[PDB]
Design a protein around this ligand. Structure first.
Ligand SMILES: Nc1ncnc2c1ncn2[C@@H]1O[C@H](COP(=O)(O)OP(=O)(O)O)[C@@H](O)[C@H]1O
Ligand SMILES: [Cl-]
Ligand SMILES: [Mg+2]
Length: 405
């Protein structure tokens, strides 16, 4: 951020600050399961208040509600409650993020007010698909809520969404989390230790598969696990995959991606066995399957199996640097957590013999919290997809949109 305004050089005295944060925290049974992303924004929030900000208005998305209000399922209200404990200060929750009523609440706040808006993605204009004049009007509303703008939303920095690139105020500054994360990755990606292994898993398959092409120019090995594997195995092995996650669009490029991995000398490790479930539920009936057996109709693969764990461990043993986004199964549910646990054990062991290990993402970082490995890997990042986009070599949109020095 040498070329961008950052919060350390932003005059906030007497100013209303509107701040984009990544408060897309994991939720299970309606409780926040990891406050990592909230805690990570506290240094920028506190700095603003300590240096005399009139207000700090916080805005984020939660989940993928796709432009419809879903306060029953994706409200940020619980985050407001959690932010209070972590700050040592109260925070006021608004039930929308734009327009007359919100604008009134943010126009002239009492000194030191902290305000959290509702889920930005309840509006189609944030993404904005799920309309140009409506997008403009949305951006104009958000811009009224502060006098200056800070973006500390590292985990969302890969998204060219309205709150991330479309706020129109004279000074748009990077926050301290944005700076911390970009600095770590700048150093870690400049001359990676090799072999450099990317571990790709998770559930955002369509997006993740689109990152592989450029990542194949940077890494020496790739594990393709979690929900992503099934698209590859269906195409390459003609494997029956039942109701497992599948990306029809990404399927069309699987063979080209494997061709490019061969050309670039990147070893691809896919799973060979699975823990299956008869429905997407913590208490599903479970089974086992191999690539050769296929997965039965009406069943889904929700974890890898033991032979896959062995292959993943072999890649980890070869690695001198690892970047991991996306668990290799539904680790939130114990029936489907063994694969991710075993891989975490390997990654912690690797760190202890000098591997540089980077784990990132809202859910993937929660694996570190669950198994108490946050200080047993090199870096746990608030960005997952955002971090993979840095690995590709891009300038993230949320950084590009900041004010130039
Ligand atoms: N085989 C699978 N099927 C469906 N979901 C999966 C599978 N493997 C992992 N997941 C899920 O992936 C989610 C995390 O993916 P993602 O959101 O892309 O990662 P992150 O939050 O680190 O960016 C977890 O909630 C996990 O349950
Ligand atoms: Cl996706
Ligand atoms: Mg996630």
């Amino acid at each position: 951020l040498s070329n961008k305004l950052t919060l350390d050089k932003l005059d906030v005295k007497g100013k209303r600050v509107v701040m984009r944060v990544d408060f897309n925290v994991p939720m299970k049974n309606n409780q926040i399961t990891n406050n990592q992303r909230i805690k990570a924004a506290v240094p920028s929030i506190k700095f603003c208040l300590d240096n005399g900000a009139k207000s700090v208005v916080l805005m984020s998305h939660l989940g993928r509600p796709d432009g419809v209000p879903m306060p029953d399922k994706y409200s940020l209200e619980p985050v407001a409650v959690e932010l209070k404990s972590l700050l040592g200060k109260d925070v006021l929750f608004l039930k929308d993020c734009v327009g007359p009523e919100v604008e009134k609440a943010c126009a002239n706040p009492a000194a030191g007010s902290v305000i959290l808006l509702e889920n930005l993605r309840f509006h189609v204009e944030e993404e904005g698909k799920g309309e140009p004049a409506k997008i403009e009007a949305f951006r104009a509303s958000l811009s009224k809520l502060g006098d200056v703008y800070v973006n500390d939303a590292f985990g969302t920095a890969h998204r060219a969404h309205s709150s991330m690139v479309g706020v129109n105020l004279p000074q748009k500054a990077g926050g301290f989390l944005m700076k911390k994360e970009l600095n770590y990755f700048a150093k870690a990606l400049e001359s990676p230790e090799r072999p450099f292994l990317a571990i790709l898993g998770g559930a955002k398959v369509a997006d993740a598969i689109q990152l592989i092409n450029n990542m194949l120019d940077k890494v020496n090995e790739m594990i393709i696990g979690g929900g992503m594997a099934f698209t590859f195995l269906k195409v390459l092995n003609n494997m029956e995959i039942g109701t497992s996650l599948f990306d029809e669009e990404g399927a069309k490029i699987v063979k080209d991606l494997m061709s490019k991995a061969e050309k670039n000398g990147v070893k691809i490790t896919l799973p060979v066995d699975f823990v299956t479930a008869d429905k997407f539920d913590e208490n599903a009936k479970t089974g086992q399957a191999t690539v050769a057996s296929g997965i039965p109709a009406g069943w889904m693969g929700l974890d890898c199996g033991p032979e896959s764990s062995k292959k993943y461990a072999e890649a980890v043993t070869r690695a001198k640097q690892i970047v991991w986004n996306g668990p290799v199964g539904v680790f939130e549910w114990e029936a489907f957590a063994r694969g991710t646990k075993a891989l975490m054990d390997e990654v912690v062991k690797a760190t202890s013999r000098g591997c540089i290990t980077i784990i990132g993402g809202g859910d993937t970082a929660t694996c570190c919290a669950k198994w108490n490995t946050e200080d047993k890997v090199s870096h746990v990042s608030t960005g997952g997809g955002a971090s993979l986009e840095l690995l590709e070599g891009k300038v993230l949109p949320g950084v590009d949109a900041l004010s130039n020095i």
